[PDB]
Ligand binder design. Sequence first.
Ligand SMILES: [Cl-]
Ligand SMILES: [Cl-]
Lengths: 413, 402, 414, 382, 387
Amino acid sequence: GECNLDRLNALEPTNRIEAEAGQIESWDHNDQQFQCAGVAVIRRTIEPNGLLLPQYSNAPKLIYIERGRGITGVLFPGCPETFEDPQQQDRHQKIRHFREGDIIALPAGVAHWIYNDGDSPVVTVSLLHTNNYANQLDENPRHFYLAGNPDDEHQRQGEGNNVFSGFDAEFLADAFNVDVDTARRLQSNQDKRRNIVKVEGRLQQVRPERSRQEWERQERQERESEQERERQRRGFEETICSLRLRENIGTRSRADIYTEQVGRINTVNSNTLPVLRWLQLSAERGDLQREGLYVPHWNLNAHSVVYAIRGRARVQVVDDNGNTVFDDELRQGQVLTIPQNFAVAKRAESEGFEWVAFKTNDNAQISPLAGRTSAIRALPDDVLANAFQISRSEARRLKYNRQETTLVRSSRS
Amino acid sequence: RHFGECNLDRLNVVEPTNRITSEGGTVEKWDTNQQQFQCAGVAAIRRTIEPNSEVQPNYQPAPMLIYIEKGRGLLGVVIPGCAETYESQSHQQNKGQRASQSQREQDQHQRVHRIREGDILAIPAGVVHWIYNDGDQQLVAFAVVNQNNKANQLDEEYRPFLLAGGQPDEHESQNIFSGFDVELLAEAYNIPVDIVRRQQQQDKRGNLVKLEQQQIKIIRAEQETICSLRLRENMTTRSQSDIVSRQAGRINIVNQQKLPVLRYLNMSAERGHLFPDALYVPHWAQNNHRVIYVIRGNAQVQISDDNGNNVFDREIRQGNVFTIPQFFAAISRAGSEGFEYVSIKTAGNPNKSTLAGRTSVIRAIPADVLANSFQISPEEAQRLKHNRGKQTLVLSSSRISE
Amino acid sequence: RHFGECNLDRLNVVEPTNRITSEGGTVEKWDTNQQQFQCAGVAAIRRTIEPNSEVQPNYQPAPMLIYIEKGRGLLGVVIPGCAETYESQSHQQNKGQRASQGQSQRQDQHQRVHRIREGDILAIPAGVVHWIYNDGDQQLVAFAVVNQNNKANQLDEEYRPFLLAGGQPDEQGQKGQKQQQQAESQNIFSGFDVELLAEAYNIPVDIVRRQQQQDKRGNLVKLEQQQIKIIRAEQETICSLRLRENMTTRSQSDIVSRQAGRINIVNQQKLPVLRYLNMSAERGHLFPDALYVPHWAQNNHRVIYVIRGNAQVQISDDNGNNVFDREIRQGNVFTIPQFFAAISRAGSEGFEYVSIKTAGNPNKSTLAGRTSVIRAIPADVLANSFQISPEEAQRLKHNRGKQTLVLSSSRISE
Amino acid sequence: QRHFGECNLDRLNALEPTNRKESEAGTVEKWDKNDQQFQCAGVALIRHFIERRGLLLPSFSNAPELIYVIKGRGFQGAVIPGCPETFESNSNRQDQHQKVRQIREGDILALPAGQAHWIYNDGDSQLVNVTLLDTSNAANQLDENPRKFYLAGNPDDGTNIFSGFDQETLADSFNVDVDLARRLQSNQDKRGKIVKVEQRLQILIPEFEETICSLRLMENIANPRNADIYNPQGGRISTLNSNILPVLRYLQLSAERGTLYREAIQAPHYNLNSHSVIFAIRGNGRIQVVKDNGQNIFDGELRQGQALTIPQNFAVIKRAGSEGFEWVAFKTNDNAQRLPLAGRNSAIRAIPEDVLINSYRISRSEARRLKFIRNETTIFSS
Amino acid sequence: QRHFGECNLDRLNALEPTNRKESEAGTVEKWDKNDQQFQCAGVALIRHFIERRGLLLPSFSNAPELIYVIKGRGFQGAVIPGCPETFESNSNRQDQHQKVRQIREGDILALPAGQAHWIYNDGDSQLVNVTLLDTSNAANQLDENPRKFYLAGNPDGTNIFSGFDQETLADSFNVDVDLARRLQSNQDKRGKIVKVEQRLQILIPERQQQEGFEETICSLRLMENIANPRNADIYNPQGGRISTLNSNILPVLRYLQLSAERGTLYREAIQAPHYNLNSHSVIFAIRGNGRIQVVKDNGQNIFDGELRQGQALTIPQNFAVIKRAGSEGFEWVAFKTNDNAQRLPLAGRNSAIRAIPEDVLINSYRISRSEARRLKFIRNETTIFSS
Ligand SMILES: [Cl-]
Ligand SMILES: [Cl-]
């Protein structure tokens, strides 16, 4: 009975790992609310020139980039290395660039590294879906490092904590056909830098730096023009191995649902990012203005793990007995898990509210209770009338008075 | 509890839990309660079938893959609803019929497969199967059951249902017909009670029985769609291999892209041949647990977990069984006689990442990322990526020439 | 055309349209404008490769199934993007690289090769480069059917092989490469500028000149010496796809009639890549005087290749018209169009055949025997349909007993 | 896919409702979801009795359900999230709502997890529903409890989903006066889950996300024109799976409707890939169930209104009494598959005589009789 | 899959537009859809020039299309049948429509057959589109003509409403006959691309208003940027970069059965000789120039020339092709006629020559072993070759 939850709580990180060039914070995956939903949550902060060591996990990950910009190398076994220096010097797999607003999907068992090549910190919030079918190992989240000497993110031959440390140095030297001293160093037995390490100088790799700067400068200038106009208005390497793993759900200009002056919701799911079909996960990015109201709704086929990015919202959650199981302000940095089918509404405070919600299904569905497209509107007038002991005229008010779908201005509350 | 969640700091080679001596052979069971098997969600059975003996038909609610280690014989698997397309209708019944023939009015049965050394057999969950050793040597079958397969809606208890036979007594558990009322079964089959009485008899013979009566009226190929599903595949690396290193060995991956029904079992198998002192590159399986069965030779195997702990460091020999958990890293070095093994995995499309060699994830990482990650020079990083040259999964000794 | 729409009043066994004699063997082509082949939308090639000879690597935009009638050899098929996992890196190679303290980015490796043998069927995906090497005792004889109407072929109906090497045997102002290469079929490298290829491959122009030379040896060439340096097994994971399957009915059969014969049906439920080729094959062995039950194919055309013995075959169309009534002998080729009804009776020495089919999941309806559509009709429906007694209707349904696809003679005992 | 249970069973029992909740216009009966037979199958079973003019108020559940209409007739409205309203009044003459379906005896209604629906009894007498709540379904991400989230009324005698919200949030959300928003919470409604409509119900009707709005949710399994198996002296069976009703491939559920004639036998068999939950509609039948080790775990009768769970692969046989026997069975997988053990198409018929001869130590004449003497399939005549 | 066309290709020419239709606010150019290479590919190619404040009126086509944004920026509104309007004004103080998306240089937009859309130039540069209309697609059950069904305006009345009686229009829309006749656009002489009044008002975040399966429909992504260097699939600092767009990047493409490629060759660099396994490739030259050769089945060269900006060339399925940029580099988009189009390189890493044993090459070309090893291994780059 892991979802018999009489009260929900806004949850903050309970463990923090400090490393040489960043830190890692984890929420308590043993909290009944995370057990109910089958997930673990972690927040990684990478300083400029910081390198998150190559690693893989037993669970698929959806990473939201709250702040900063950088590069990530996802390691697809058997896929050709298509980024290479000119022949006469290095070759490696494709480099992906991430920025604030990006969602990154990492299948279980796929190794990756991440590097902050900007001037401000990278902050990434990750949902580990430990209850995922792809994880036949352990309900607890596990992290397998390929390099370095990490601390366990959910606690606080070789002596190090990466996988090479579990092998005899002689075995590794033989396998890699390298000197035994070099194989010993694979074990990172003397490394004091923990999970995120500092790069001296610039990280060298094959990537389109020059053209990328010309492209980002062009967009910044288009953002500038648009901002100004607005104030004036007053082989198989091409296919599987090229699989897209990121989508910018924060893009200012994109919306799946939008009420002018009120709010917007952007969603990523398998209809937009194909790999989510295999991860069985999705995400939404929500922004509410002052008085913006996300009307009462329920998630039909998913838990919704909400991470408050900034601002504040009064959130109400109701279970199957009509009990209010949450009625409080959700604050920046906190996580609220909304169990599948529970009804929820969110009303921003005067400063507004932004959130990202990770949903435990490939194409998570919601049903609004009020407004256009709502469950109430699908009901016959006379079903409403007899169900609530009201007239058919009052029933039509409940159905049509609110002409927006999903997001609307709330003046009373 | 902790073993179920693969919280093990120490894996061991798994020894058969019990031995049943039947009239026609011996059955050894690796039960689902061994800690390594709790982690992997599997059970195993080794059956040694004497010449001219058969196994008693049985079914179970989880799928399994069977490796024929030795001998030759005949396998029956029934597929409900499929027509019986193996038959021995004679000219004399043809002529008898036409000479005066309708509904009110010598054998027919479903297809039987010749099986031999090196075959892998796919038994879907719930399908009835039986085996006949018609050879002059012992037939040895090693089966791994995926107790955690989606197909098994019961639980992790290994639960075989017998159509015939029972637990042996001197060279409880009885067949399902014993639980039915005798007269009701007779009426259902429309047969004399005494035939049902013989079906329900306590059978002290066991799970495997001598074929006292001759068996040459079984229809055999060597005398449709779902019904046409192929169930056996020869795994010898010498006839088919995905990786071949001239001086190191061969690997043959039998997944759903070789044997279609493995898509639905969500199970696969690998056969490997390591020449003396060769290695299997360090690696981890991304979407499957593995049960390894050593068929020839010996090797040094090491396994590491997510905290850098060595969890396995053993010389394994012929007949040894051990588990490699999903996500754990493993490496193998064959002894000076080489090494041969079969690996049965809990995915129909298994995927692994290798760490050394031509297709490794290390070669996929920029050298300068490796340099900073391991605190080595870019030149040391370059050798990590490139010193193995062309070899990927099976690696020649870098130490002992030959 | 009347043929392209299968409005054929008579079908006949189809003889090879071209015979091309190369240094290393012979190529026989059944070309697409044969009337039977226009109906079925197929081409066929029979290749007989002399021992220690190789086919010149080639590819084509339609899928192909290849039956190995005799011999044994090695098959190569390239899958773009798959790592080359057959290699012969040597201990001396390894030692050298390590001890130098200098290995970095700045004796062979190639893709998987398959042992093929008599009785094998080979699946060649459209567009895949393939080559054959006969390293065995006897001539290697391969019979290939190419599905020109397959969805993978976006070109047109003319059979189109592209040669990486070899050519025809015999014992804004464009810049004139077409004028230059001429000096009636060449490999694709002859169509490219010499200097461009040299730069692209980073090799001296001399090697490119030899690549582009007109090669009068043909499609099959004798090898200098035995190719001992090829690595062989017996010396998304599409790279692991199986492309060969042995059809011998004695090793596997779906239908076995002790007194009549055997059928082995190789569809996508036995060889998974057939799902994507949307082709399949069947091997049958009929005992003397046995029959193949009257039937029709619901979702495929069939090309039949007679591999042993002989039989009489009849084919009927939707008019009750006999469109085929011939005695068929070893080596004959003929077509059964989709939906046409067909029956065969083996001769005195039996009959073996291979059938190549334009569906990965073939479906046929039989008319006589244990799984026939006739047994599925109510007896009184048969009685009124045929104007026969209910007694005769019953006999139609049950006189053939437990046999379904392969039927013993009802009139001659073994 | 499915969530696991504990299937160590020694004795099955024929199960009747253990809890009964009375509403103004009907009763809801609950079988004991805690029973080990239901925990093994991973399901709960519910029966609704809806009086004339009675309305089962709109609700949704975290468990997918199959609802079998045992008797009566009426209307169902399923609320598809995001789909337009395609039933409407003639605007030049008011009402507008999503499509409604007539339902009647024999209908199976399939409801995905989280989908709201209501039901109205349009007939003259009782409308009786029996619902299978598949709590171990992959689509139920909560736990074993099959919850009912009511959009209206006060099932607990607020207690609908609107009761838990502040009236001010409700007023703003619907854009209505505060007194009208309070009525949503149904605080003083004492009528329960099933209520009498005023007069007659006024309704518009003619007189995975991949299925946007157009998917069939109902199909009749009792109609004898639909029979899959028929023997004039044995009975008839009709199966419902994704090859008949596409939505069942997403719900991973099947159903079977059985009629045995007097003294007839349903062949001994086992369910290859699912549990089977039997609900006896009418008549009575002797049933026998046998577990993995050959032990009989049920040797008794099933009568009207009783339920019996057959775990996956357990062997079962049924023989009707002298008036016959009718049931519906819910099966916990898409395309549930039976393997008969006797008769045509059976496992015994597929095994060579020579193997049976050695298995049972019978002669060939006895193995021939065993294989071939019952020439019927699945349903055996008396 | 596709309907078939004639592919007896003896000669290819670089192709430029042959028809042009001028509107008041732009220009629509059509390549010759009856030139043999487009008939063989089964495609038509079109280019729109949309001047500032120009509006490409709403229309749908029987052909699925891929639209590449050559230059500029604007908005696209696709009309998904049956889906609710999820963009709306704040009613608690007007407009309501389906979601609109900002588009810009390098965007590929995918449009199923039969689906209406409109495009607006929101910038000051001309907005330039190159659209591939896939007329042999299984989705096109008409014929090889790529038809445009206009919902408004007078593209030649000549929109869809023009052919209905106004009484039928009046009753259907429930409007007066004055407004119904307006639907027919009988007096409109502006063509297909028209100037909006002042600036177009539409709902979009931070732009405040003033004064072929359906199983994915409603939530599909329809656009992806293939020119952004950060999305490169292949990159060589002295060769260039390639980016492929297929159903593993954009799920709707699995139902359109189309792919695309965006290439940039640096000065003098080479795109390895190769062929496309499973599709035709329609190359449109975006900038610079490239030497290109195409070879057909019997080894004969059928194209030996240059491709300059604004020109298009078709490489039929399996024909071999090589490209070498000029001294200023070469940039193109290629539209490919299958889901998950795949290239088989003939030279370099991952190529057919490299997959073949040296011994076979020795006998194939009559070269020595040292020649064979150099043939296989001397170019160690993949796909894009440096200069
Ligand atoms: Cl990406
Ligand atoms: Cl989009």
